[PDB]
Structure 1
């Protein structure tokens, strides 16, 4: 009745027609890259960088 996404932590993947594949709700959770360096993906199978947040109008 309350969803998988309502309590945080189980996974969900998404497929689109005109948009990009996504994974999970809280997976990459914040105060992880606050310290050290969590350097990010060195890409070899490049999916996007900002997830279609442009073309706002």
Structure 2
């Protein structure tokens, strides 16, 4: 209210309930720790994470 000033619709959310549009808002084959990351990729060998 008084505090809202020009930030009301930002500190508040109002569902319409009953009374630009949404712009159309994967799955991959699947511990230790602390060894700095070194990502590797290859022409033939599949890429991997060396976490």
Normalised to the residue count of structure 2, the TM-score between the two structures is: 0.30
| Structure with greater helix percent | 2
- Please say which structure displays the higher CA radius of gyration: 2
Normalised to the residue count of structure 1, the TM-score between the two structures is: 0.27
Higher relative contact order (CA 8 A, sep 6+): 1
